[PDB]
Ligand binder design. Structure first.
Ligand SMILES: Nc1ncnc2c1ncn2[C@@H]1O[C@H](COP(=O)(O)OP(=O)(O)OP(=O)(O)O)[C@@H](O)[C@H]1O
Ligand SMILES: [Mg+2]
Lengths: 158, 596, 79, 79
């Protein structure tokens, strides 16, 4: 099976935007937020979800159950396998840092509650351990760089 | 001869400046070439190339009977094919073509006839008489061939298109397919039908005021097949032939339009009269298939009965929409969808909009609200009317304007041909808004993904937020249609609905206000599915298995349906079976309990 | 030539001589046996499209810094 | 198309090949060229039938001579 999943995932994850959007879908499903097109646009840091050619890809159709253009996951045992094995840890930590910076950067104006709870939910250790399982160096690097991305975190005991 | 009323009709049609000329062999009969003579016809050229090949075979030393039987061969196609397939020196054939088809000087009638303003120029010549005649007369020209993409030259003018090729920058290998000389070239899979310029040619001869053929002998069969069928095209075309020709000689041409046997010489004088008026004419015309949306100018009172009509019975006026648009605090009269602002922000950045939704979840009303707001922002919004008038003429007249334009099309699956043309030949200052149901979108996926959809933003209005649920129940609270349920809180009220039907406007309307309009829509869609007894039995079996609660399985469905239609692949491609049961990978599941 | 106009071509045509004008987007092997090569190094006007101003017609300060130039073309060896 | 794909050989009896569609069918391929035989009239030079030679092998013997081949081959075809 793993070989089948790898072959059918390499047919979509080779593009940069497709990889970012797929990672955004997996990340928001991991946190538990609703999979809304406008919010997945902010998490994915592009607007490829609005194109009509995203939902007709091999990887997107073969890994996610699509229905009337919407995207939802198949099961947790495939999403967590994708997160652990198909996405490298070194990609995951860097993309997490990028989206954490960008959310704040565009949230300093709009003041949306969903972005705020997204940011304070990414900082929790349970999600990070569910995203980077038993990786000491990457977890340490992420925790030591999040305080330098945004300077208000030092005053927060959370 | 040719009558005076035909003269007046021709002058009036050519003075518009939207005429199209088709140039043939007879136009450049008087020109002169590099070797200082009139360009030759097929007979002389065939004799020359046969003589050349026979001289080569005499040099190699073949029998004299073969030479004497090849020399008298005056068929251009067979002689050229034999030369290219047996004789190895094709460089001198290309040199002979360049010598014979390079015009050095033109006459004055050609200058006067090509100093007009046309829509587009089409020709079947090899020479450069037309390009020389356009420069000399004070106008630019960019020639092309069938091997050029028309989308790159969209904004260019003075497009002189050569159909059977050109010799000006022809290479050695172009004789096989590009230049239509041999029998092998005419049989190639690459022809005028397969080229992308064919659709452009059809649109041009559909859109033009009149079409003029200059000395065309009507040899090609594809143009004959284009022009034979229709009659509205025949009423616009004209043919120009040489003098001293009887009607029976022009009988072949007469089946495709009027025949005027005066020659290019006499048409040059008409061109001399019409040149000054050709460049001046301009008219905004009238737009027939698209009505210009205009905002409200007066304040009308809104009465409860209007609230009841809009909420339940589906009847509303555009004055109501314009009134709820100007003031955003009036939540007791309309539901404010959050997608309108996103859609507006997308349309301000040169992006097309495609809206897809389920049955009756607020799509046409969203289109009307968008139309009302975008004119206030400063655009021009046109609503597509399902009329019998043309659409290419109207989009052309819209392009001739100079304002920012948004065009709205509702339920495009019923006008897929026009909606295609719209995405095929869209201009720079015209955006598109297309709305459709899910079934209509999925039935036309293969007709649209082949084009450029990178400029389209896809939106779905199927679901709302909890704030909009609160707004809806606030509207009903102001209406007071709860009855005995008004005492209970928010949670109790909607306790009888399913999770996903709660977040859809159609099921909310049917469950709370019992909108008859939605009932009529459901009856209309389900009638076309439940007409057959087999499908009726299968649908009733699915509903029975759901109200029991036991899971759905193909064998069980077939057992309780007293048939085997569930095994057929056409059961899940019906109208009602798709619009009433959500399907996924061929399986059938129901939407919600309040629908079943 | 370096001009973008058609004076050379009109002069050749008016003197009883043919011409095949090209640019740097043509390969030399397809025109190996050709004669009267009027190669326009900078560009051409006669059938220029809208995208030819960026790199094909050398006029702007961006069309002089593009990776495609006279050196990297296939006509450099021929010249 | 399927019949000329599955057959053993294709025989033309006095066909001048006037229609353009059979011409477009038979001109492209080369495997169909090996199985195609054209039967034309007697007393014809090679050139008089150069057009037919492009699509397959041509035999200038007529139906008159083909009758003898049919009479010699009939008893084997049914067997
Ligand atoms: N913005 C809105 N605010 C309040 N009610 C609305 C709104 N939009 C739609 N409705 C209600 O929904 C009903 C059906 O909406 P509408 O006719 O626009 O559906 P639709 O999706 O365009 O239809 P169809 O898909 O069948 O073409 C209307 O009669 C109206 O009562
Ligand atoms: Mg509608």
């Amino acid at each position: 099976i793993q070989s089948r999943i790898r072959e059918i995932s390499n047919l979509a994850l080779n593009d940069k935007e497709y990889k970012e959007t797929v990672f955004a879908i997996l990340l928001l499903d991991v946190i538990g937020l609703p999979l809304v097109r406008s919010l997945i646009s902010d998490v994915a840091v592009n607007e490829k979800i609005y194109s009509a050619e995203f939902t007709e890809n091999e990887g997107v159709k073969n890994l996610f159950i699509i229905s009337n253009g919407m995207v939802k996951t198949k099961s947790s045992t495939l999403s967590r396998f994708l997160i652990a094995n198909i996405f490298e840890h070194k990609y995951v930590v860097n993309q997490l840092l990028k989206v954490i910076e960008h959310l704040y950067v565009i949230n300093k104006d709009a003041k949306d509650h969903r972005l705020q709870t997204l940011i304070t939910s990414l900082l929790r250790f349970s999600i990070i351990e569910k995203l980077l399982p038993q990786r000491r160096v990457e977890i340490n690097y992420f925790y030591e760089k999040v305080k330098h991305i945004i300077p208000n975190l030092i005053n927060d005991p959370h | 001869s040719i009558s005076d009323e035909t003269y007046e009709r021709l002058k009036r049609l050519i003075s518009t400046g939207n005429a199209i000329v088709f140039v043939g062999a007879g136009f450049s009969k008087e020109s002169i070439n590099i070797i200082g003579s009139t360009p030759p016809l097929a007979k002389d050229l065939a004799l020359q190339i046969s003589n050349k090949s026979a001289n080569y075979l005499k040099e190699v030393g073949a029998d004299s009977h073969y030479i004497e039987e090849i020399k008298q061969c005056d068929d251009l196609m067979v002689a050229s094919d034999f030369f290219l397939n047996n004789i190895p020196q094709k460089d001198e054939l290309l040199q002979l073509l360049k010598d014979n088809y390079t015009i050095k000087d033109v006459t004055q009638e050609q200058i006067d006839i090509f100093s007009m303003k046309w829509r587009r120029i089409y020709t079947t010549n090899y020479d450069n008489a037309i390009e020389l005649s356009l420069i000399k007369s004070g106008k630019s020209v960019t020639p092309l061939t069938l091997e050029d993409a028309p989308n790159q030259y969209k904004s260019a003018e003075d497009i002189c298109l050569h159909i059977n090729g050109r010799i000006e920058r022809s290479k050695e290998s172009d004789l096989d397919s590009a230049i239509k000389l041999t029998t092998s070239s005419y049989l190639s899979p690459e022809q005028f039908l397969t080229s992308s310029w064919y659709r452009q040619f059809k649109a041009d001869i559909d859109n033009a005021s009149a079409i003029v053929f200059l000395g065309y002998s009507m040899y090609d069969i594809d143009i004959q097949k284009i022009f034979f069928n229709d009659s509205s095209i025949k009423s616009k075309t004209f043919f120009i032939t040489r003098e001293g020709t009887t009607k029976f000689q022009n009988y072949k041409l007469a089946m495709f339009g009027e025949v005027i046997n005066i020659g290019v010489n006499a048409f040059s004088h008409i061109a001399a009269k019409c040149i000054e008026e050709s460049h001046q004419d301009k008219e905004v015309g009238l737009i027939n298939s698209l009505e210009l949306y205009t905002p409200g100018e007066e304040h009308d009172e809104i009465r409860d009965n209007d609230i009841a009509n809009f909420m339940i019975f589906g009847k509303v006026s555009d004055r109501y929409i314009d009134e709820v648009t100007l003031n955003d605090n009036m939540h007791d009269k309309i539901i404010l969808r959050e997608e309108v602002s996103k859609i507006i922000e997308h349309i301000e950045t040169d992006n097309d909009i495609l809206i897809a939704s389920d049955l009756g979840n607020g799509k046409s009303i969203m289109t009307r609200m968008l139309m009302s707001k975008l004119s206030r922002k400063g655009y021009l919004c046109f609503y597509y009317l399902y009329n019998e008038f043309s659409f290419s003429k109207d989009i052309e007249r819209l392009s001739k304007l100079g304002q920012k334009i948004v065009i709205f099309i509702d339920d495009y699956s019923n006008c897929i041909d026009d909606t295609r043309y719209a995405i095929e030949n869209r201009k720079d200052n015209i955006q598109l808004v297309l709305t459709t149901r899910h079934f209509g979108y999925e039935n036309t996926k293969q007709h649209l993904l082949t084009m450029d959809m990178s400029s389209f933003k896809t939106h779905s209005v199927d679901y709302l937020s909890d704030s909009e649920v609160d707004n809806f129940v606030h509207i009903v609270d102001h209406l007071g249609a709860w009855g005995e349920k008004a005492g209970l809180s928010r949670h109790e009220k909607l306790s009888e609905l399913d999770e996903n039907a709660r977040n859809q406007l159609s099921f909310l309307l049917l469950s709370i206000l019992k909108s008859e309009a939605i009932q009529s829509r459901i009856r209309e869609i389900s009638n076309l599915a439940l007409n057959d007894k087999e499908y009726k039995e299968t649908v009733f079996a699915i509903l029975l298995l759901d109200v029991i609660g036991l899971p759905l399985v193909r064998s069980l469905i077939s057992d309780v349906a007293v048939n085997e239609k569930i095994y057929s692949a056409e059961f899940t491609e019906n109208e009602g079976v798709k619009n009433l049961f959500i399907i996924s990978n061929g399986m059938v599941k129901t939407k919600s309990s309040t629908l079943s």
